[PDB]
Amino acid sequence: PIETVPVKLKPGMDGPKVKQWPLTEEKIKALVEICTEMEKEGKISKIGPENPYNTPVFARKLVDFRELNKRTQDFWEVQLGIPHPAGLKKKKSVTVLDVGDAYFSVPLDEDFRKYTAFTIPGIRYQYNVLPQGWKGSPAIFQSSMTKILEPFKKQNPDIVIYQYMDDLYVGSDLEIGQHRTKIEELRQHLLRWGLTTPDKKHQKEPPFLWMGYELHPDKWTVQPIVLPEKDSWTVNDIQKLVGKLNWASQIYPGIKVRQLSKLLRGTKALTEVIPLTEEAELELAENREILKEPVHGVYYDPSKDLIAEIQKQGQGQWTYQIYQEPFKNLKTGKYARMRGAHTNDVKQLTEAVQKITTESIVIWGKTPKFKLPIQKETWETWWTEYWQATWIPEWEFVNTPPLVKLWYQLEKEPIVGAETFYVDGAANRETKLGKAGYVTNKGRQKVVPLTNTTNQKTELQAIYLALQDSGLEVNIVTDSQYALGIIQAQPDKSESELVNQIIEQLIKKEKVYLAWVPAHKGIGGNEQVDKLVS
Amino acid sequence: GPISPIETVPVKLKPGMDGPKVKQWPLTEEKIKALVEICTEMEKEGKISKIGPENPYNTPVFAIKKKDSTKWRKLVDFRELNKRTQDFWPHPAGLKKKKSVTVLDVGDAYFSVPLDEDFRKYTAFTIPSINNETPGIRYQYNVLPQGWKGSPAIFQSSMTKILEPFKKQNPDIVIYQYMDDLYVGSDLEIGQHRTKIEELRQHLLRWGGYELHPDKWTVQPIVLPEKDSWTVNDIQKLVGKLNWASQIYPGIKVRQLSKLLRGTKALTEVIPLTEEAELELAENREILKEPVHGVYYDPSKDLIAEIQKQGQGQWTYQIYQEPFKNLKTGKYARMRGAHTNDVKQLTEAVQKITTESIVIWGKTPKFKLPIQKETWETWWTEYWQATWIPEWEFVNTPPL
Ligand SMILES: O=C1Cc2ccc(-c3ccco3)cc2C(=O)N1O
Ligand SMILES: [Mn+2]
Ligand SMILES: [Mn+2]
């Protein structure tokens, strides 16, 4: 009864014709029983050798639609992500329905049924429903499921129906008896469209399993994820492996899928043996201890505010909690990013505030109030002096050490009575020899030999020397904007050990004034140290 | 649902270009609710139609409120679709010269001319749900949409017939049209400008604001410091200042000033100006007022606007098509969010610079913004009050 979705192949491309693998009397009989069943249920139709196309079938039954998927058009996946149980509000009555044979109950475009052709190892088959494993079956089903559900939701405004794939979440603040009949209507409404809902895939009492979450009356806990410790993986339970683990990635961050997936750079048959490259053995194992950690949260109350508190941890890691009542957290997580060039803690905190803000808008459609381990004056000093535009939403200070600080601050005007160091660096040809030195208005000077360096590194080395051999107050003059701009970025950490100790000198200093002049002009301080590194 | 009674114009994309495929970003609850109430009424009025996942294209959508506006206006970020849409088929240089110019939102008039039935799939947009509770609601346009660069081009025929009864009873009213807006300027009294802009407004209603004053828009020129007691630091800051302007004006000379700093001197030491350097300074001060050589507007090239954060609530900007040959330079101050929000001031300045560029040249610039991508991409939609959207690059290298 459902209107079909028009499916076109990619332009200039024909259907798939991958030869069938011939196999044994053992499971070649099960297929035709399976298939007659499917033909007796209307899911597949018979045609002879008229259409050319072929899709391999292995052996419950399995179909390999990979070659067909590479030729099928792109479908806009409407979903911006999965739902989070913390996004749910508490409803007096909850129900989780699951549709029986979700895919095998939505008709396929009749013009597109020809390329679906396959042959039992003989009678040839072509699908008339959404096939499992095809590219478009998820998008077409959910679209079909939605507009099939819309007249029901409109005529039943007192209930809320959340739909994702097979599982239907049906919540309401109605009486259980009234909530009872409203469900049976939905099942009867679904049954009239050819979508049955079995009775023990029907979830009646609670802990209600919706998308791998146990929905207790006043809490939710993620379903313990357990996936196999077998010995000889094949690339189907390697593709079901990458599948049901990179949905776990949404609730469990840090679960990456690069290794496994890379194992299908080949024309492999879906049933043949697949060797684990030893790179892939730590992939699973790295987070098998992450997967075993529990997750639990509370439900959302829109009458109260959202509070987000962030804490500082080791090695550029940050923890955060999102709650409405104190310590009754809706969501918690970890964030870990140190920059590849130069980062400081205030930047990382600004990034953490922004990353939580976005996922808060994703889940609740609003920005939380933040409690951050930073002084108002520390922040005020940072953003007003930062060369770039920056800002954070409405927040308040929380005294949870280690607090975030500014570890140094360059001065804005040159310092009277402070030693003025002019620095420079240089390199020569293929010589693999560098010079970084300084000259001082008081006559002080120094030059050191360098081994394997860039040209920036010489300029950064020159600045570092002036910080070493100077008092608590110093004015430094460089011709290098690279060096001057790196300190202008105000980093407190670095992967460059030279930069790290320039920081360490900068922290120990009392007043530093960095100054820039164009090289190879008549400037008195620049040219003297420039000749010394000639 | 209902087809348009009047006839459709054929439109195509650029050669060899496909339609836009831009992911929808997360929306606040108030905007989704606003987009839901707006798109339902638009769908009932046959202006948009629900589509499935067979359409592989998508364009972002959100909603804004204009200055002092209390109602939500839908904004569709057509920046990608416009980039891939064909060019169609003059800019009134007198719009800049008028005393008062008002901007009117004529985007609703576009909802009466139908979109090419074969072009409609490229206007697909999806309204996301909170916490992805339900799949987003997909739509495409059946009529000329607001924010598409092809809508005012196709409507130019109809718009001309609506405005010429007004424009020859007022042959000195400059009327420029850019995207969903009409820019209308005059040299009239402020009292007599407002009711003549309201009569043109109600003449539009016969078929079926926000005010500017462009004759006092400033240009901030290059200004050298002129203190009286120059220190070493004050002079070597002017030397790199002048050595910088030598890229714009090749006639700058900095040597006799640099001669004053010869020898390793302390930055705070005051340096007397040997008078052959003040001649170099007075000449440099006056070789900064002439027009830059080779500066003109090429409407076949993109505009570029760079914005610098000066702090204390002031922001400098330069409009140019190729470096050092600036078409316009300026500075803003005391905008909304001053001394409290850098993003809100940058978002305002982007709106102000673009409004100027539309009035002057009839084109919006490509902005280089002094902000990380992630900070700007988190807040800019919260302060946007313009019916157009420009394109931007992010600047992470400190200037001067
Ligand atoms: O002696 C010299 C000559 C020089 C030329 C060009 C550049 C340069 C190009 C782009 C950025 O910087 C830098 C230097 C420099 O640092 N020293 O020291
Ligand atoms: Mn140098
Ligand atoms: Mn040098």
Q: Is ligand 1 within 6 A of the CB of residue A479?
A: yes
Contact indicator for A5, A42 with CB cutoff of 8 Å: no
Q: Is ligand 1 within 6 A of the CB of residue A519?
A: yes
> If DSSP codes are grouped into helix, strand and coil, which group holds residue B195?
helix
Nearest Cβ partner for A162 among B134, B236, B376:
B134
Tokens representing residue B105 in the block: 């939102």
Provide the resolution (angstroms): 3.0
Q: Mind telling me how many Å the CA of A519 is from chain B's nearest CA?
A: 9
Q: Is ligand 1 within 6 A of the CB of residue A424?
A: yes
Chain A contact present for B29, CB below 8 A: yes
Cross-chain Cβ contact B262/A517 below 8 Å:
no
Residues 6+ apart with CB under 8 A from A124: A46, A47, A48, A49, A51, A117, A118
> If DSSP codes are grouped into helix, strand and coil, which group holds residue A177?
helix
A355: phi then psi, degrees, rounded to nearest 5: -70, -35
Same fold, B10-93+119-159 and B212-297: no
A328: phi then psi, degrees, rounded to nearest 5: -90, 80
Q: How far is the CA of A519 from the centre of ligand 1 (A)?
A: 6
Query: Which amino acid is it at A14?
Result: D
Contact indicator for B23, B128 with CB cutoff of 8 Å: no
The segment(s) of chain A belonging to CATH 3.10.10.10 are 1-78+104-137
Domain A207-300 in CATH: superfamily?
Reverse transcriptase/Diguanylate cyclase domain (3.30.70.270)
Contact indicator for B358, B183 with CB cutoff of 8 Å: yes
Question: For strand A208-209 and strand A167-172, is the pairing parallel, antiparallel, or unpaired?
Answer: unpaired
Q: Which of A88, A388, A487, A520 to mutate to test the interface with B (most CBs of B within 10 A)?
A: A388
Q: Mind telling me how many Å the CA of B280 is from chain A's nearest CA?
A: 14
CA distances from A282 to A277, A279, A287 (A): 10, 6, 9
B94-118+160-211, which class in CATH? alpha beta
**Among candidates A57, A360, A525, A44, which has minimal Cα distance to B235?**
A525
**Among candidates A112, A115, A170, which has minimal Cα distance to A140?**
A112
B220: phi then psi, degrees, rounded to nearest 5: -85, 115
Tokens representing residue A80 in the block: 């911006």
**Chain B residues with beta carbon closer than 8 angstroms to that of A79:** 132, 135-136
CA B358 to chain CA mean position, Å? 7
Residues 6+ apart with CB under 8 A from A250: A81, A82
The strand ranges marked E within A337-472 are: 342-343, 369-372, 395-397, 419-427, 434-440, 445-450
Contact indicator for A291, A225 with CB cutoff of 8 Å: yes
Nearest chain A residue (CA) to B341: A391
Instruction: Please state, in angstroms and rounded to a whole number, the distance separating the CA atoms of residues A148 and A170.
Output: 15
Q: How far is the CA of A485 from the centre of ligand 1 (A)?
A: 14
**Among candidates A131, A143, A129, which has minimal Cα distance to A77?**
A143
Tell me which architecture the domain covering B298-400 has in CATH: 2-Layer Sandwich (3.30)
Q: How far is the CA of B249 from the centre of ligand 1 (A)?
A: 21
**Among candidates B61, B328, B350, B104, which has minimal Cα distance to B218?**
B328
Nearest-CA residue for ligand 1 atom 2 is A519
Instruction: Please state, in angstroms and rounded to a whole number, the distance separating the CA atoms of residues A118 and A131.
Output: 12
Domain boundaries, chain B: 10-93+119-159, 94-118+160-211, 212-297, 298-400
Matching CATH number, A1-78+104-137, of 3.40.640.10, 3.10.10.10, 3.40.50.300, 1.10.760.10: 3.10.10.10
> Exposed/middle/buried for A159, CB within 10 Å: 0-12, 13-18, 19+?
buried
The strand ranges marked E within A404-481 are: 419-427, 434-440, 445-450, 473-478
**Among candidates A415, A411, A519, which has minimal Cα distance to B240?**
A519
Instruction: Please state, in angstroms and rounded to a whole number, the distance separating the CA atoms of residues A403 and B157.
Output: 64
Edge-to-edge strands of the sheet including A419-427?
Answer: A445-450, A434-440, A419-427, A473-478, A511-516
The segment(s) of chain A belonging to CATH 3.30.70.270 are 79-103+138-206, 207-300, 301-407
Name the CA radius of gyration of chain A, rounded. Answer: 33
Residues 55-74, chain B, touching A (beta carbon < 8 A): 55-58
The reply, when asked if residue B118 is annotated as ligand binding, is: no
Q: How many CA atoms lie within 13 A of A299 on its CB side?
A: 14
Cross-chain Cβ contact B239/A521 below 8 Å:
yes
Contact indicator for A368, A306 with CB cutoff of 8 Å: yes
Name the CA radius of gyration of chain B, rounded. Answer: 25
CA distances from A105 to A145, A219, A317 (A): 10, 34, 47
> If DSSP codes are grouped into helix, strand and coil, which group holds residue A499?
helix
CA distances from A146 to A166, B49, B394 (A): 12, 16, 40
Nearest chain A residue (CA) to B311: A384
Cross-chain Cβ contact A80/B231 below 8 Å:
no
Chain A contact present for B375, CB below 8 A: yes
DSSP B104: E
Experimental method: X-ray
**Among candidates A496, A358, A478, A497, which has minimal Cα distance to A421?**
A478
CB atoms within 10 A of CB B398: 17
The reply, when asked if residue B77 is annotated as ligand binding, is: no
| Secondary structure, 3-state, A328-346 | EEEEEEEEECCCCCEECHH
What's the helix, strand, coil split of chain A in %, to 5?
Answer: 30, 25, 45
Q: Please name the residue that has the structure tokens 């390697």.
A: A238
Question: For strand A118-119 and strand A213-216, is the pairing parallel, antiparallel, or unpaired?
Answer: unpaired
Cross-chain Cβ contact A528/B264 below 8 Å:
yes
Contact indicator for A467, A444 with CB cutoff of 8 Å: no
The segment(s) of chain A belonging to CATH 3.30.420.10 are 408-534
Contact indicator for A525, B258 with CB cutoff of 8 Å: no
Number of CB pairs, chain A paired with chain B, less than 8 A apart: 208
Residues 6+ apart with CB under 8 A from A253: A333, A334
Q: Mind telling me how many Å the CA of B232 is from chain A's nearest CA?
A: 10
Nearest-CA residue for ligand 1 atom 3 is A519
Instruction: Please state, in angstroms and rounded to a whole number, the distance separating the CA atoms of residues A224 and A221.
Output: 9
CB atoms within 10 A of CB A310: 23
Residues 267-326, chain B, touching A (beta carbon < 8 A): 267-269, 309, 311
Contact indicator for A69, A112 with CB cutoff of 8 Å: no
Q: Mind telling me how many Å the CA of A133 is from chain B's nearest CA?
A: 17
Contact indicator for B196, B173 with CB cutoff of 8 Å: yes
Nearest-CA residue for ligand 1 atom 18 is A519
Question: For strand A296-297 and strand A219-222, is the pairing parallel, antiparallel, or unpaired?
Answer: antiparallel
Nearest Cβ partner for B264 among A80, A146, A441:
A441
Domain A301-407 in CATH: superfamily?
Reverse transcriptase/Diguanylate cyclase domain (3.30.70.270)
* B212-297, CATH topology level: Alpha-Beta Plaits (3.30.70)
Neighbours of ion ligand 2 (CB under 5 A): A 424, 479, 519
* A79-103+138-206, CATH topology level: Alpha-Beta Plaits (3.30.70)
DSSP B9: P
Domain A408-534 in CATH: superfamily?
Ribonuclease H-like superfamily/Ribonuclease H (3.30.420.10)
Nearest Cβ partner for A391 among B262, B268, B343:
B343
Residues 6+ apart with CB under 8 A from A510: A472, A473
Residues 6+ apart with CB under 8 A from A340: A495
Contact indicator for A521, B243 with CB cutoff of 8 Å: yes
**Among candidates A146, A167, A165, A163, which has minimal Cα distance to A98?**
A167
> If DSSP codes are grouped into helix, strand and coil, which group holds residue A377?
helix
Cross-chain Cβ contact A517/B231 below 8 Å:
no
Instruction: Please state, in angstroms and rounded to a whole number, the distance separating the CA atoms of residues B262 and A406.
Output: 37
CB atoms within 10 A of CB A166: 17
Contact indicator for A214, A207 with CB cutoff of 8 Å: yes
Q: Mind telling me how many Å the CA of A265 is from chain B's nearest CA?
A: 26
Segment holding A61, helix H or strand E: none
B10-93+119-159, which class in CATH? alpha beta
